[PDB]
């Protein structure tokens, strides 16, 4: 795997409609000053989240919702 920490920088808002999934933004604290222009990816999350929560990322360069 890749386990790449990121801090939930804020609650982006509510996306989905099941009452299940929320769409939230992740900020990379994984970087040590390595170049990232991404630089804060939006990620869909499963279950409850809170700000300052670290979580591992199995993927990077995610725009989440897209047009689909």
């Amino acid at each position: 795997d890749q386990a790449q920490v990121g801090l939930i920088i804020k609650v982006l808002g509510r996306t989905g409609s099941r009452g299940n999934v929320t769409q939230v933004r992740v900020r990379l604290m994984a970087e040590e000053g390595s170049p990232d222009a991404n630089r804060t990816i939006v990620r869909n999350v499963k279950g409850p989240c809170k700000e300052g929560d670290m979580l591992s990322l199995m993927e990077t360069e995610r725009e989440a919702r897209r047009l689909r």
Partner: protein, 104 residues
Amino acid sequence: MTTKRRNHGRAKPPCSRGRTRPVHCFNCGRLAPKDKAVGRFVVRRMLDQASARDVAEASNVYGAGFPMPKLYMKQRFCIACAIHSRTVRARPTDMRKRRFTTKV
């Protein structure tokens, strides 16, 4: 029957033309008169903000170097078309008479 709309859903006034050319739709290919047809102007981005950053990094002569172009188009829609993507919606009586002219 009842005159629901004075201008009849047209920008064509009575006693002038009585005929204005048909125009295709960019959805379903339906034809309607130009005046009836529902015009919008899009100004569609060629990159999302999120991706704009990443590409402007790898650029030197572009992005920072010149502001990115956009795809411009006019979009003439049918009635049914418009309503279903909810960019035109039903309004109460007082509001239906309002216009905003050709400005956004």
